[PDB]
Amino acid sequence: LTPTETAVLRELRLHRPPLPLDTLLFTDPNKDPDDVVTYTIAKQLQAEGFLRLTDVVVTLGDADMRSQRAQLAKGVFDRLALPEVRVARGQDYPMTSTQAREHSKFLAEGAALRAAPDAVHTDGVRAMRERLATSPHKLGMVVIAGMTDASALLAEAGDLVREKLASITIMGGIDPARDADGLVQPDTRAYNNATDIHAARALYRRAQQLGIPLRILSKEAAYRAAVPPAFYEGIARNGHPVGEYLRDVQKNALKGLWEGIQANLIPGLDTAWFFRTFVAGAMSFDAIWPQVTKLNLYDPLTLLAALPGAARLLFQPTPMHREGASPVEHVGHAEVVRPEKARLLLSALAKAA
């Protein structure tokens, strides 16, 4: 609605690509208000011809947990005017007791969003294999979740998967130490890398050995491109059920944090820290909420970096590959040169849809 967001949106219009790009997506929805933002901006981009979502994959749960996650994702897509994307369940991966306890997370607000319990598909990456084999052009792969199914897809038919893929975009981390053979290994601290370390190592090694370009996004890109809270109110002002859902979940998470930080329950954090990275005694939250300006969006920046059309507009990838190796580059906090236009794109292509 603001003139500058319309101007940057028409600039992006003028910077359109000639052919839409079909992307394969792996997500773990209903854990944070981020993946729903990614879905919304992907839909809005598809309506503009930039991209075209084909299939999605759910992860981070047990059989029933992942079934429910896929059901909710299908419901969100159906109510987002996207009745084409196929929802597919993942495959089982090893879990520890602590890991199982923390991966059984399921917020109650998403219970109503689940669609009819028959449209879900519980096969896996079997459908994606056929489309990848018979696709007349090249596809890109975006990973913002666990790497299990992604590792499974690239472990078979190396020639096929290297001849019909463009690049891989992942939100994760890079271990500072080089591999024994000079390759680049994922670190153990990143959440996506820590979901399944073996699958992450296999993905990185296979991608670097198969010649597929690799796109890696750190966690500080959102720090450089934080969003004001008026974005949530703007999207939810019109009574959209999805926007209401994200507003509710963000409010719930923020007030849970604000109550937890009181009475020093969480070690290493105090009231001073909250006012540092979220603002610039202990009152009610209803007065704390207006004075926040630095909320974070992590995975949408990965989707933005995946598309080469908008990659050059605001990012600046830094090469890190050895002279003899597959092209791999990392985008961090220093590579984002125009955070203002980044926030403008998030607000624009999330508000319109």
Binding site: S97, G124, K219
Partner: protein
Amino acid sequence: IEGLLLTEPEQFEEGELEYMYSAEALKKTRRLRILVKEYYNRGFDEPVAYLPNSLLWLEWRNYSSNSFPSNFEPSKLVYLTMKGSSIIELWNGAKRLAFLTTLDLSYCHKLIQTPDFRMITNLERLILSSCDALVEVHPSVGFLKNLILLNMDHCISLERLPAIIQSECLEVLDLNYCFNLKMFPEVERNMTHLKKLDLTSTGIRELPASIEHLSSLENLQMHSCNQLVSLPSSIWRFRNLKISECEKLGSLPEIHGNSNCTRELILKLVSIKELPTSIGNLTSLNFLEICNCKTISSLSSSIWGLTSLTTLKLLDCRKLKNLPGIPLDLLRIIDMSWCSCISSLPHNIWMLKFLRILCISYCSRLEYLPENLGHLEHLEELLADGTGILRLPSSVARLNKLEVLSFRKKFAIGPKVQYSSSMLNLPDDVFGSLGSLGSVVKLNLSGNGFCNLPETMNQLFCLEYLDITFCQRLEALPELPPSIKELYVDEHLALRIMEDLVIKCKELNLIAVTKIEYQNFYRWLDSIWSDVSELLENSQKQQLDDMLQLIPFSYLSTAKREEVLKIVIHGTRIPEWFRWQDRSATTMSVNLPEYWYTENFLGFAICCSCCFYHSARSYDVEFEGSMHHYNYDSSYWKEYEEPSYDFYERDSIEITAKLLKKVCSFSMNVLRRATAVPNMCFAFFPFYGIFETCLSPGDIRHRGKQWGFNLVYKDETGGSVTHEML
């Protein structure tokens, strides 16, 4: 035809490729041995329904519907490979294959059951990979007398193997990432011929008692086995054992005295309460490492009878209490790190000698260290990183073989560092324990509140590495040894020391200057990029300029040293004494003028802007990023332990200057609270071309953004270079 190799399909474009393998075409064959389909199907396939009964060598990819033709009885085969899917029920059963040897099925994603093996023998390679729905292996497979390579990889649904393995010469047995198994099969005979036994990420319950045979492997590595709870005593017949990441073990097998050979013991991420208290019977150990066990409260009894152990490593023993005490002569390595609960060390160690490696790292609750240390004249490395030891033990001057001495204290970062009650007003004047020493190479002191220094430092020799890090309340350094290559000093007195000692000291390579204010300004992680308080740089920007102005320049004489002059200081901007500044492009390229030798040209002075990171920065950013959402629960925080991290790190960068090849490396200290700070780094290399300086092919974290460059000259260091570029 006798041979058919189907090439790529993008060469005919009429359908001849489907015709060749069509049923009506193979009638004319009447003789065929090899049939390979090395091309993956593009979008289309034609089911095959003949399969002539004469093949010997067959490779198929993306096979048609489930079953083979019911009339396929080749009665002779050698090699079968399938990379396809939906091939369930290969045969109806009881198929007589006489000569068949090699069977490979890869990524068959729905194979529900293998065929029967009642007749077929001589099967040398059996490979099954990525079989997602497979819950049975037809235990008749274990009755083959000649099996060489059994591969079972990424078997998601695998449940049971054959109960008995009768093979006498098995070389490769791989069970990878199954994580759903129930029991390892029990073997009967001895496999003298065996090369690889892979058992990775398997949900086994416990090994059987027949593992002694597999003692022909002499190694046993277990990783991420998250289901087993007990192990047999037969595992003690292995030379190397490495057990890691077992969330629930609870116990270790009792030692039965059957095995007397074992030297490698590595234990990580395991719940072991105590050792079996009978470790002495092994009497062959050389290396024992216990790393980060949450419940290791009691270690063992009479562990000191292992017949002269060599390497003892105890890391992150958060609950391991006071050691039993020595009642050994080949002990080199003793490492204890981050042992919080330990309160004291046994005294009788001062009987023990020939040690040479003693490390006490980050043990906060240890104060009264052993004091006598009589006849301990063999130590070489002594590390003391934790608090508690306020005063060094007396009679420490008796030993004269120490070479590495580390002494670090932990403080609180703020506007001004405050010592612990000013070291309890310790008598700093009488500190002479380190002065009485001799032949010390590395000497590190940090966080110690001493005002005076020993006056006998001239007697001490070969002190190559000297660190005094955050040591305030100090007025001056009395006298320095003439052989200090690396010096780390605080900014409070830094300008005087370099211009006072570089001219005198012949070998002074690297000087690092540390300031607490620049350290504590970046206490928060966001401060590196979000914004910067301008005046702070003006606090130290002229500091670098005056320091550069006060430098003795006599490096143009004969080469006394093979090294160059290296200075590391805080800051993030050019000190403006450089006449050639480059904002960006993370690279340098200067087209210097020519005919420099009108006056003698001392050398090129180069400056770089970088920033060093603590080794644990990823944890903090990930933690606070997760905090941005905070989907945690109250019960989660009741038992959350912060992962122990070293409070001091040494971070280094490498640069190369090309025009002769010269490459040199930088280094400085980084604190735990302040993960990353920006630093100015100056290098001077004494001596048609284009000056170039790239950082390195690697250096993932380190880029550098600002550069400077001048030409210095003779005539009392005029520096009046005829260079006009920017």
